[PDB]
Amino acid sequence: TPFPWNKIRLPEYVIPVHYDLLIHAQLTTLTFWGTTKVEITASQPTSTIILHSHHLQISRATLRKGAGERLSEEPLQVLEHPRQEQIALLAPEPLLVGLPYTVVIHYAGQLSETFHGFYKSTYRTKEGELRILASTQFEPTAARMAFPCFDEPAFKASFSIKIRREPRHLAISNMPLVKSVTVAEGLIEDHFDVTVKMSTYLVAFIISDFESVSKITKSGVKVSVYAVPDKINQADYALDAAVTLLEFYEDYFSIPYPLPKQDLAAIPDFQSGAMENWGLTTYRESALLFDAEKSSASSKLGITMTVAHELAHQWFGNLVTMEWWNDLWLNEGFAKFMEFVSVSVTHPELKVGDYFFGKCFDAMEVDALQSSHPVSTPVENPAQIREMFDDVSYDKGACILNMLREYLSADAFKSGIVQYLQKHSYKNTKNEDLWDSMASIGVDVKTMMNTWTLQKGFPLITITVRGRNVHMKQEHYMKGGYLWHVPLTFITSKSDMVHRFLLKTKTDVLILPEEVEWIKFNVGMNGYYIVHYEDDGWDSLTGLLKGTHTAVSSNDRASLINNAFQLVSIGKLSIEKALDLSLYLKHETEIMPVFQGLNELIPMYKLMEKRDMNEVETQFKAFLIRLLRDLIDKQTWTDEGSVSERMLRSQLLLLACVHNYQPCVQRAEGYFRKWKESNGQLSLPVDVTLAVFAVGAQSTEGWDFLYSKYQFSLSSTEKSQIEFALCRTQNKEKLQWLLDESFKGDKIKTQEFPQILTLIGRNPVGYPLAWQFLRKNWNKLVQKFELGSSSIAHMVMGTTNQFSTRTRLEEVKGFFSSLKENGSQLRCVQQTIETIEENIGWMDKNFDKIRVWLQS
Ligand SMILES: C[C@@H]1C[C@H](O)[C@@]2(C)C(C(=O)O)=CCC[C@@H]2[C@@]1(C)CCc1ccoc1
Ligand SMILES: [Zn+2]
Numbered sequence: 001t002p003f004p005w006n007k008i009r010l011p012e013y014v015i016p017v018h019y020d021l022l023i024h025a026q027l028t029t030l031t032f033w034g035t036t037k038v039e040i041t042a043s044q045p046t047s048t049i050i051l052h053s054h055h056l057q058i059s060r061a062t063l064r065k066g067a068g069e070r071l072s073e074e075p076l077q078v079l080e081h082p083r084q085e086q087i088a089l090l091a092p093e094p095l096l097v098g099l100p101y102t103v104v105i106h107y108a109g110q111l112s113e114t115f116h117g118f119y120k121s122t123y124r125t126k127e128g129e130l131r132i133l134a135s136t137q138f139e140p141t142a143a144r145m146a147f148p149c150f151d152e153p154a155f156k157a158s159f160s161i162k163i164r165r166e167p168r169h170l171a172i173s174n175m176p177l178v179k180s181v182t183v184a185e186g187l188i189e190d191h192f193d194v195t196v197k198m199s200t201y202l203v204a205f206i207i208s209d210f211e212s213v214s215k216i217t218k219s220g221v222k223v224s225v226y227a228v229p230d231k232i233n234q235a236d237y238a239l240d241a242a243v244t245l246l247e248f249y250e251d252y253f254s255i256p257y258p259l260p261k262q263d264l265a266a267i268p269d270f271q272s273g274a275m276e277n278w279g280l281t282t283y284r285e286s287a288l289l290f291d292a293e294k295s296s297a298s299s300k301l302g303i304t305m306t307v308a309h310e311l312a313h314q315w316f317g318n319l320v321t322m323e324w325w326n327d328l329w330l331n332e333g334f335a336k337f338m339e340f341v342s343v344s345v346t347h348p349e350l351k352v353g354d355y356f357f358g359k360c361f362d363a364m365e366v367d368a369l370q371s372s373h374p375v376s377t378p379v380e381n382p383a384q385i386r387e388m389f390d391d392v393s394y395d396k397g398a399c400i401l402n403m404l405r406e407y408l409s410a411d412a413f414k415s416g417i418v419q420y421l422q423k424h425s426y427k428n429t430k431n432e433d434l435w436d437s438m439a440s441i442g443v444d445v446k447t448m449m450n451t452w453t454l455q456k457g458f459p460l461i462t463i464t465v466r467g468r469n470v471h472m473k474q475e476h477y478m479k480g481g482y483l484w485h486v487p488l489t490f491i492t493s494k495s496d497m498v499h500r501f502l503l504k505t506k507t508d509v510l511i512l513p514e515e516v517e518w519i520k521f522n523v524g525m526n527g528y529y530i531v532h533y534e535d536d537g538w539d540s541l542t543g544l545l546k547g548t549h550t551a552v553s554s555n556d557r558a559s560l561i562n563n564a565f566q567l568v569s570i571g572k573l574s575i576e577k578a579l580d581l582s583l584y585l586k587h588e589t590e591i592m593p594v595f596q597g598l599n600e601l602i603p604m605y606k607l608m609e610k611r612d613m614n615e616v617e618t619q620f621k622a623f624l625i626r627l628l629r630d631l632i633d634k635q636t637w638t639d640e641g642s643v644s645e646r647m648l649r650s651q652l653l654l655l656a657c658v659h660n661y662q663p664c665v666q667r668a669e670g671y672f673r674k675w676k677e678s679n680g681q682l683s684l685p686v687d688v689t690l691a692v693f694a695v696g697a698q699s700t701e702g703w704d705f706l707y708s709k710y711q712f713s714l715s716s717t718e719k720s721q722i723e724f725a726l727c728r729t730q731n732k733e734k735l736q737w738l739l740d741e742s743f744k745g746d747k748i749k750t751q752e753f754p755q756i757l758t759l760i761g762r763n764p765v766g767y768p769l770a771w772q773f774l775r776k777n778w779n780k781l782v783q784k785f786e787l788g789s790s791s792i793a794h795m796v797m798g799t800t801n802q803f804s805t806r807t808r809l810e811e812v813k814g815f816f817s818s819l820k821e822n823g824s825q826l827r828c829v830q831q832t833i834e835t836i837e838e839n840i841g842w843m844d845k846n847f848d849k850i851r852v853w854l855q856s
Pocket of ligand 1: 594595596598599602651654655658762
C-alpha cells in the first residue's frame, strides 16, 4: 500500500486548532502511553490526514465529529512512512470543508535514551541512591517522538496537557496545575491549564521528585526554580535574576508576559545549555545553579546571560515565531542580542556590553569560510534544521542586529521591535516582516538588511587617506559580485565623537573637515566587518597602541589586534607586522584586548603542538609568557575585585601554569599539596582553582585525589574545574578512561562527553586518542547527540580543526566521506576540512617567518 504523501513538509490544508495530550510514563519500565486528541479543520476535501510521528507505536486511531448526542466516531486506518517521520490516517469518507473534527490517537513509546523527545534523566542522592525522572526537549523536531502532531512551527495551536503519575512524584508542565484527580491503578491525573496558541516544539512536561523555590513579580507572575532536593539551595540567584529580567522585558517591550507563572527547571541530563519552553524553561544544572562559595565569576555571568536568553525568547520565539527554520535567526539572533540589552540594564556591574563584540569575532571565524551560509538559508530535513542552531544564527544574527540598532539609534530600533512583536503576536514571521516593522518608524532598512541576511560572509573595508580625502572600498573577505550597505563608524585624532558614513557602493570618499594624524574605523567593533589601512596605516596604528594605547578604548584595541591577524590570513599584512603590533600587549591591563591577544596567539602554538616543531613551539610559548609577564606577576591569588578582574586573574594564572611559568607552578603546587593534605577541606580561592587543579592532576596521586572529590561534589563549577584538570593529564590510559567513562555515562555524565572529547582533542599528547575515539564510536555518538546537532559539530571541530598537514587532511576527508548518509554531508565537516586547508597554507607560509621573528 503506497504512502499517500511524497513531501517532507506537511500538506497545508489540514490545520490544527487545539490538542488534548494525556501522558502516562512508567518510570520503572521506561515505557510511556498517550492519548492525543487534536481538533482540526480541512480547507479542501480529503479522506487523508498526514501528520508527524517518530518511534510511536499506534494502537488505535479514530476520527470524531460533533459532541455528546450528535457525536460520530469513524475508524482511521494507519500507514507509516518512517523516513519522512510521517503517518497517514485514512478516513472511510471525505472530511467536510471548514467543519471541526477531532483526531483521537492512542499510542505507546519507550522513554528516549537520548537528550531529546520525552527522555530519561537520572541522578544519585548524597546517600548513593539512583533516582530516575522523565523530561522533554522538543526543539526543533522531536515533539513528534512524544505525541503525534503537525510538527512544524507555523501550525500553532492551544494545548491542554494531562499527566498520569504516581502519588510520590511531581508533574510540571507549561501551565499551572488546575486540578489533580485520583484515577485507577493507584495513579493521580494532573490537569494543567490550556496554553495560549503556540508551536509544538514549546510543549514541555517533567515527572520528577524536584523541590522548588518561588518569588512573585511586580506584575503578579509566580516565578519558580525547580531542582533536585540536594541542589535546591543553589536556586536563589537564578530566581532573583529571573524575576528582575522578566520585569525588565515586560517594561521594555510594553507587552506583558501572558502566563500566570514561569518555571526554571535544572535538569540533571541536558544536551544544550537551556531551552525556552513557554512557562517551563529548562537548563543544564551548570547553566542555572549558583553556589556562593564554589561558583566562578564566569559561571555567575553565564547563569545571568542564559536566564536573560531564555526569558527574551518568551517574546522572541514564543509570542512571535519564525514561519520556518530557514529564518531561525529571528528567534536566536534576537534572544542572543537581548541577553546583552537586558543584563546591561539589570546587572550594570557585570559590564556585559563590553564583551558583546567577542560574539561577532566568534561568528567571523566560521563566516570567513566558503562553507558558511547566509543568515537566512533554505533547510528541509531535521539534520539541516539542527545545523541552523550555530554561530551564524546566534552570533552573526545578534551582531547584525547590534549594527542595525547603532545605525537606527536605540529608540527607533526599540519602536520597531515593539511594533513587530505587537503586530505578529501569536503568529509567525519571515525576514521581510521584521524589515517592514523596522522601516515603519529607516527608509534603507530592507535593502541594507537583505545584504546582511541573504549573502554569506562579510566585507573587508579598505581605507586610503589623501590629505582630508578618506577613500573607502568594500570587497568580500575570503580566507586563503558581493555588495553590502555598510554603516561605517569612525573616530579621529581630532574628534572622539562617533562619526557615521553609510557605504552603499563598492567605493566612496568622505572629506574630513581638517587633516588628521590618524583615523580608526569600526568604533568599539560595533560593525560586522573588518578594516585594512593602506600606506603607513598599520605602522601608524601600531605606533598609537605603543605610545598612547589609551588614545582608543579597550574594545578598539581588541578590534585592531583581531583585524591585524585576520589580514595576515588573506596576505594583506605580514605575520611580522601583526606580531610587531602584538608587542604593545606588554603594557595592556584590560581583559578584552588581553583575551583577544590570547585568541589570536594561542591557535598558532596549538598547530605547532601537533607537528615536529618542538623548538619553535617552546620559544613561541616563552614569548607569550614574557609578553604578559608583568600582568601575570601582578595577579593576587584571591577572589578580590570586579567580575572582569576575577576572570582575567583566573585565565592568566591558568595560562602561566599550563606553560610551566615557575613562580606560578611553585605557588600552584603549594596550594594543591596543602588542599590535598587537608583531605580537600581547606578552601582554595575559586579564581586560582583551575590553575591549582591543572597542576595537581600532573601526578597519579593528585589525579586520583581530584577524581575522588568529583564523585561527591554538588558544585557545577567544581565539577567543570576537575573535568578540565583531569583532561590535562599526559597519561594516555587516564585520558582513554575519561573518554570511556563519559561516553558510558557512569562515573561522568554523557552530557560532559563533547567538552571532554574537545579538551582531550586539545591535549598536547592526547589529541590522537580523541580523533581515534570519534572515528571508532561515531555511530553511537550520532545516535546519542543527532546528526546536525551543535554537539556533533563541536566534536568534529574539537578533534580535527588544529591539524595542519596534507596527511591529516586526507584522514579527515577519507573518514567523513566513508559515512555516506550518516555524516558525509555535515556542514561542520566541510568547515573543518576548509579550516585544515587554511592551516596547511598558513603554516607553510608563516612557520619559518615566525621562527625568524622569535630569534630577533
Ligand atoms: C579556550 C582555551 C583553550 C586552550 O586549549 C587552553 C586550554 C590552553 C592550551 O591548550 O594551551 C592554554 C590556556 C587556556 C586555554 C583556553 C581554556 C583559554 C584561552 C583564553 C583565555 C582567555 O582568552 C583566551
Ligand atoms: Zn535561544
